[PDB]
Design an enzyme around this catalytic site. Structure first.
Site, PDB file in Angstrom:
ATOM      1  N   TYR A 190      53.916  41.350  38.236  1.00  0.00           N
ATOM      2  CA  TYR A 190      53.275  40.068  38.209  1.00  0.00           C
ATOM      3  C   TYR A 190      53.236  39.721  39.610  1.00  0.00           C
ATOM      4  O   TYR A 190      54.040  39.639  40.214  1.00  0.00           O
ATOM      5  CB  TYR A 190      53.871  39.026  37.612  1.00  0.00           C
ATOM      6  CG  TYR A 190      52.702  37.986  36.548  1.00  0.00           C
ATOM      7  CD1 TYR A 190      51.506  37.395  37.239  1.00  0.00           C
ATOM      8  CD2 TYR A 190      52.627  38.440  35.301  1.00  0.00           C
ATOM      9  CE1 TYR A 190      50.350  37.108  36.384  1.00  0.00           C
ATOM     10  CE2 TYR A 190      52.337  38.202  34.377  1.00  0.00           C
ATOM     11  CZ  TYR A 190      50.375  37.328  35.149  1.00  0.00           C
ATOM     12  OH  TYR A 190      49.978  37.032  33.424  1.00  0.00           O
ATOM     13  N   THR A 212      32.116  48.293  42.118  1.00  0.00           N
ATOM     14  CA  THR A 212      32.651  48.947  40.792  1.00  0.00           C
ATOM     15  C   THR A 212      33.609  49.712  41.994  1.00  0.00           C
ATOM     16  O   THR A 212      32.882  50.673  43.117  1.00  0.00           O
ATOM     17  CB  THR A 212      32.066  49.092  40.147  1.00  0.00           C
ATOM     18  OG1 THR A 212      30.892  50.133  40.712  1.00  0.00           O
ATOM     19  CG2 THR A 212      31.259  48.192  39.487  1.00  0.00           C
ATOM     20  N   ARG A 256      38.654  52.102  36.312  1.00  0.00           N
ATOM     21  CA  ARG A 256      37.432  50.876  36.374  1.00  0.00           C
ATOM     22  C   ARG A 256      38.230  50.046  37.653  1.00  0.00           C
ATOM     23  O   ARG A 256      39.277  48.848  37.499  1.00  0.00           O
ATOM     24  CB  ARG A 256      36.996  50.196  34.697  1.00  0.00           C
ATOM     25  CG  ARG A 256      36.044  51.622  34.985  1.00  0.00           C
ATOM     26  CD  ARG A 256      35.822  51.217  33.424  1.00  0.00           C
ATOM     27  NE  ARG A 256      34.862  52.275  32.621  1.00  0.00           N
ATOM     28  CZ  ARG A 256      33.514  52.498  32.849  1.00  0.00           C
ATOM     29  NH1 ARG A 256      33.134  51.012  33.369  1.00  0.00           N
ATOM     30  NH2 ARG A 256      33.365  53.140  32.278  1.00  0.00           N
ATOM     31  N   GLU A 315      50.946  37.505  41.883  1.00  0.00           N
ATOM     32  CA  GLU A 315      50.206  36.343  41.551  1.00  0.00           C
ATOM     33  C   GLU A 315      49.746  35.783  43.328  1.00  0.00           C
ATOM     34  O   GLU A 315      51.090  36.202  43.892  1.00  0.00           O
ATOM     35  CB  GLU A 315      50.248  35.191  41.341  1.00  0.00           C
ATOM     36  CG  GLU A 315      49.932  35.146  39.762  1.00  0.00           C
ATOM     37  CD  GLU A 315      50.189  33.892  38.990  1.00  0.00           C
ATOM     38  OE1 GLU A 315      51.411  33.625  38.647  1.00  0.00           O
ATOM     39  OE2 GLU A 315      49.697  33.450  37.696  1.00  0.00           O
ATOM     40  N   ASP A 336      25.234  44.384  46.725  1.00  0.00           N
ATOM     41  CA  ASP A 336      25.752  44.499  45.084  1.00  0.00           C
ATOM     42  C   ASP A 336      25.627  46.665  45.411  1.00  0.00           C
ATOM     43  O   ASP A 336      24.744  46.791  44.865  1.00  0.00           O
ATOM     44  CB  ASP A 336      25.733  44.379  44.352  1.00  0.00           C
ATOM     45  CG  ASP A 336      26.360  44.826  42.849  1.00  0.00           C
ATOM     46  OD1 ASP A 336      27.224  45.974  43.239  1.00  0.00           O
ATOM     47  OD2 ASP A 336      25.860  43.883  41.924  1.00  0.00           O
ATOM     48  N   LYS A 338      32.227  54.864  38.688  1.00  0.00           N
ATOM     49  CA  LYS A 338      31.057  55.267  39.070  1.00  0.00           C
ATOM     50  C   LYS A 338      30.515  55.913  40.425  1.00  0.00           C
ATOM     51  O   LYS A 338      31.614  56.863  39.418  1.00  0.00           O
ATOM     52  CB  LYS A 338      30.032  53.891  39.753  1.00  0.00           C
ATOM     53  CG  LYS A 338      29.735  52.970  38.318  1.00  0.00           C
ATOM     54  CD  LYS A 338      28.398  51.868  38.823  1.00  0.00           C
ATOM     55  CE  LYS A 338      28.205  51.087  36.686  1.00  0.00           C
ATOM     56  NZ  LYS A 338      27.789  49.585  37.817  1.00  0.00           N
TER      57      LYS A 338
END
Ligand code: NA
Ligand code: NA
Ligand code: NA
Ligand code: NA
Lengths: 453, 452, 461, 453
Positions: free
Chosen positions: C62, C243, C252, C64, C217, C246
């Site tokens: 974790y 992304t 991903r 954050e 984008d 692709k």
């Protein structure tokens, strides 16, 4: 204290102010297209004991008792509103409580749309009204553009007509829930059938805001928006010649039934307004009865004739007209061929007791110095002006424009121009001479209302 | 056609309706606390050629010319509004264009808040106004609850007083941007200093909506919300006794305050169109009246008459919400008497006494109110004194006793109401009471014109 | 009690032993990938190296917050990994770190876009993107005539711009005209089904005129941009999303690039970072960040530029082969990784064609064409080059792919002549013996051809 | 280039970083209550060819073809999720696509609420999560507080327990459309029946966000929120010990049917997300099957026993515990009676390879120096720690607190304290000695996952 003393005895300061305003109305040439002169009978209802009564709710469905008489008045006003516009009460209802034209439109949007739902109206510089959704490039101006999401449609700048082709194209992309057909500065008839075609295609409600033209519609001198619209709003003043108030008309009955009535009535009260102004409702009922008469049709025919005579006289004196003429109560003058902007022209005219307003023209580069003036026929037609009289009006206007052109040649900025009109003794003498002739002419015509206030 | 014909000649149907409404006003005992009778002088200004002038904008900054006289009238109205409330123009400005009380409040919210910003007002059943943000468990009712996010504060049910402690507790959690101090059905004085304390803690604007009490404030017979509020809204009718209209007062100057431009812009161009100059003039007439010793005496008499009414009701075994009154109205709890406010209101209406059914803290049915709201302003304007209000209470008690008899004979509320009309013995009793009420009421003077 | 009944759990067991049901499913998916002709333009095959980072102990941390500004301690290594990923992202796109920053935490492409809108816009502020049927993406603000589809159209107010139907190109003239009326706060330049290069300079002209932010984008084309084989949106946009899968060939995930430093400074950085966390997301997926870093390093190499050039050459070869076989192409050709086929003159719609192709192990997508009269029966097919280029397909191999596609189209035409509605067509493909035999024969040939080519990743999963 | 090369060969820089993180995990004492160590089997699915497949939509209802295997994987994951929580598939469905816990919650709100609808969650300083609607006095922080209107509920400061009475009182006034029952720093069990009573009274949906406790729920060692909530969200990591992802469970079938399923699925896709992460879905399915076993029930019982042993060991040493104890996997220590705040303590612990987090306590005056620490049992329990081992952990914590108290007596501000830990030779030697003993202790326990990465 009784509260039965007259205004002239108990508040001489206010009495003198009222008399001064009445004298100003009588001695000037009122060319503001949204102005009219209300009848004494309507004003007698407006300043009556009906002011005293709280009657939140609707006839037979009030929150408070003692409403038996105001119920009869509100129902009578509704019936007279439907009759004035030749409406089948099985197909149309009406709400007579809106406090003015702007409250009427806000209630329609609140009734039929969720916050941030989309509306399209004619852009303000192109002749639309603030309440049709106006915002500028730099801030949201009308509350209609704050609580709802507006996008304007435009005139074709070459013709001065609403660009229906472009409206259809952009409505398909923006997907408005409501489109407003109605104007504050447009001299032509709106193609309501085309507006309905667009609304049917994109599944939007069609609201006709007929405030400027409502008297002409009632008189049946122009085509009626009620043939095509779902909802119709209007002021009760302007061409209807009543006290200041508003109306919302809505389809009812079978279209599967319409579902406007309950939402519209609920939006007006309890959502937006408080107690109705029963004195205004009564005054409106008086004016609506007048609007049903042969007298009112002759008045409205004369309004059209006078606007046309004014348009013709301006074209003969070297002015241009946006859209090339008029089919209604007003004329959009393009002063650019004369070389004097509308801000300068309106002020010169004001100083000779002619009230008109500057108006943006297609192609204008500056809002401070717009290219034109808007001139209306309703108010002076109510003083029994005929075509020859409107030709004399145009003669006075042209004289004022000529004074403005000479002052323009002697001044630089708009502020210099304005101060010169007051400070230059020669200019001051010329304006005083023209003012005296305008006022001598204007005072010779009758005036609706009380004698001195 | 001249447009100079008299209404009585040109529209006899409407003229007869006006006269019927005037007769109704003259013959009734008007106990609706928000009602009053406007002076003839103000009505003469209201029905004037000022209707004929479009004056969008503000004095000296209009869209159209020809406004020299309406500018003087609007400026005069502003000056008289500040004078009536004893306000220094260095600290306070006023907008005199709102079309009514509800338009005034909406303009304040639009001026100071973004859509969906938070507001707190007194809940409607607890004595607040619709425009303070009312929505039910079922749907959003006031547009104030649609365009903004409202959460109510409540009375303490045991005392009948605003629960300032719970307001502070819940304001800390909800974080309102604006809190409204103002009532439509409350008989006590608002602790504006405490409201200011809460607003300072949570950084909310304090709006005082003084519509019900404005005349009492002007007359200095109760404490003024202007000592503590950022913004003050009011109607110009009700206890101020003017034409129907609204006002927004706002702090200006050093605090610098930034209310003035936002408030004025929200009224126009954001919300309204052309001002109603005839209403502005009529309001100015009433505001000048409100500055006089006459008006202070009137407002003192309003307080005395409300107290006399409260005392007379207590002597006859009625209970009062909060135990009494410090203002112009009385909140009667009819529950211990065995009759509810819906039943009582209708009986009284049928004998020409107009009052309001009123929700009470002890109510067990959210649908049928347990009480009545009774006001002194309207009859005080007709020169009623304390003994006259004692007589009013005796008439009310006769009506309540008739209601109790009918209740014993009928089932549902609608059956009760129909029985008042169609039971011959009941209608005869109501007719007798109505005649005594009306002959009493007609003998008092009435502000306004003689017959309309 | 013996064997597995006498062995304590360690969490170190192999998947193939501990969950045979799942292991069989993974192997079946790998076999499907290896035996098919993957023509979905958004698909690719991730390297083993990136997958090894993706399935690592970085899942267990974790973190954050941001490097050096975490809520929890023990982040020294994940800080180095996140900073390294940022540096590699800027390097892959030839960006000066004094002028550009990057947020590497977005969970995917759609989360990246939502964070940009949340950072820069208020609820109900206005956005314009290319309409979905015209080649835009859902996250650019799609709603139908019937209801609001993308959350972008719920929390914000979207209005689409359109292709010129006659040319198949973005109608920049109409975008300028409508942006003046609608007054968007943000305009999106980026596509999901467009075969030509976006005029980013013109998009920036429009945005400058109406005072809107320009968001590029670039998800579909990001690898081509990194390889410098097509022009870069970074020359004209001040925010760029993408992304990491692709054409970039990573795990991903998503990225948000933003201008920073002297513009008077830019003010994107703090708003964008705050929108990602704490506003929208929770703990970053550090395993994905590491896998992305691996792929971004690959994207900086000469190998990757040759790959990207081959993607362009293969798309052009596919386009030429289709033209030679009588097909029509939307916009007349391609300048990127994909081809838009208009099947209408051939007499077969894209829904019918896509289903025939799927049954012979060729995956493509039906695609709306300009002028189409029904969404159930779109007129076209979208075909992409990236995935098979990653399997060492060259131009002649794509010509062979087109031969297979043409056989499938001919089967579709025969079935169409024998069936009425789309559901009848689809049922006929499964139930008619003659048709099923023809499909089985073509499928056998497609799969033997496809299996012959190499495949990135692990051997069997 | 084949894309079949190993990470160690092809990217030595990244490989070294992975090994360094693995070593840090193995040598430290992980006390962050939201942390766990995922199995190798789940990680093998996470790093697989499933990354390569675009499968927008839902099983049997995809946009693209070729989804037959991913459809089977997604359906298997759904079935295993329902099995792990003892749910009848005729009464419950589950969406396995949310990218993480925060995306799961946002999808629920988007599915069931309009923009600006009202939500209530436990305040962040009181133990709630950001995604339950947090905003400060000065800024809207969580997107939940931007797109929706949130108001917190509070602990009773005297008891440290959720104040259900005040929640009921304020929910009647605020009228939330959804109330969230779920915590990030709370050591007690939530009264879900009482939460459902409040929601039924005010007509709000009850959402249980069980992310912290989901493994305990699956193992049936604490009461299940599914008995009282009809929507449940969770992470798949934390106590469930899976790859990072999210889940949304919802009631379905006859309730007049429930209407959650279609709205929730639509909100996840197409509204909010793009292509699912099929590798994560597969890894989650692997972990969910593990969560159904007797092994996992014994693990979860041990988590509870270990948290209780830690709490008791702290109490025996004179520490205070917020709420007076624990009923779950974590302990809320109040360090204020010992004279050392949680910011100072967390940093000392970090430097000796013990990871815990500072925690706000009831009555704290500053968030910069909160009064407490949050300590969790799940991660070390996954390394075969039992009660005696947690007592050793508390011995080490107490040594660290004592070092912190000594440094506090020698330094002024927090920055001076932190500098002293690094720059004072005596202090750095004391920290190094304690760090060596902690790491020698921790390294001896096993670790789930791969050997070196
Ligand atoms: Na000049
Ligand atoms: Na009864
Ligand atoms: Na056919
Ligand atoms: Na110290």
């Amino acid at each position: 204290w009784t509260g039965q003393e007259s205004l002239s005895d108990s508040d001489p300061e206010m009495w003198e102010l009222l008399q001064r305003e009445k004298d100003r109305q009588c001695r000037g040439l009122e060319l503001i297209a949204s102005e009219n002169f209300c009848s004494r009978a309507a004003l007698e209802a407006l300043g009556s004991c009906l002011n005293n009564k709280y009657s939140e709710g609707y006839p037979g469905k009030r929150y408070y008792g003692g409403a038996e008489v105001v119920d009869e008045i509100e129902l009578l006003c509704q019936r007279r509103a439907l009759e004035a516009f030749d409406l089948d009460p099985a197909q149309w209802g009406v709400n007579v409580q809106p406090y003015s034209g702007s409250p009427a439109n806000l209630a329609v949007y609140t009734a039929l749309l969720q916050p941030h739902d989309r509306i399209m109206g004619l852009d303000l510089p192109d002749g639309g009204h603030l309440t049709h959704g106006y915002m500028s490039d730099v801030k949201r101006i009308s509350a209609t553009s704050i609580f709802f999401e507006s996008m304007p449609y435009k005139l074709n700048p070459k013709t001065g007509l609403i660009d229906y082709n472009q409206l259809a194209l952009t409505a398909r992309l923006f997907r408005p829930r409501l489109i407003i057909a109605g104007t504050s500065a447009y001299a032509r008839l709106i193609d309501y059938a085309r507006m309905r075609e667009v609304c049917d295609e994109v599944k939007a409600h069609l609201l006709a805001d007929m405030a400027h033209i409502s008297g002409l519609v009632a008189a049946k001198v122009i085509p009626s928006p009620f043939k095509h619209a779902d909802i119709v709003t209007t002021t009760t003043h302007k061409t209807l010649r009543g006290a200041r108030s508003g109306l919302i008309f809505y389809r009812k009955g079978v279209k599967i039934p319409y579902t406007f009535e309950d939402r519209i009535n609920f939006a007006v009260f309890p959502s937006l307004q408080g107690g109705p102004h029963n004195h205004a409702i009564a005054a409106v009922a008086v004016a609506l009865k007048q609007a049903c008469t042969p007298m009112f049709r002759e008045y409205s025919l004369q309004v059209l004739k006078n606007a046309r005579a004014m348009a013709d006289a301006l074209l003969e004196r070297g002015y241009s007209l946006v859209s090339g003429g008029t089919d209604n109560h007003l004329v959009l003058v393009d002063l650019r061929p004369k070389g004097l902007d509308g801000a300068r022209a309106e002020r010169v005219l004001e100083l000779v007791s002619i009230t008109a307003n500057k108006n943006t023209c297609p192609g204008d580069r500056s809002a401070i110095t717009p290219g034109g003036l808007r001139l209306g026929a309703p108010a002076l037609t109510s003083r029994q002006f005929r075509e020859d009289d409107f030709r004399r009006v145009v003669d006075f206007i042209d004289e004022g424009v000529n004074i403005g052109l000479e002052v323009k040649s002697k001044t630089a900025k708009l502020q210099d121009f304005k101060s010169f009109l007051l400070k230059d003794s020669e200019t001051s003498q010329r304006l005083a001479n023209l003012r005296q002739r305008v006022e001598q002419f204007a005072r010779a015509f009758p005036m609706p209302g009380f004698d001195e206030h």
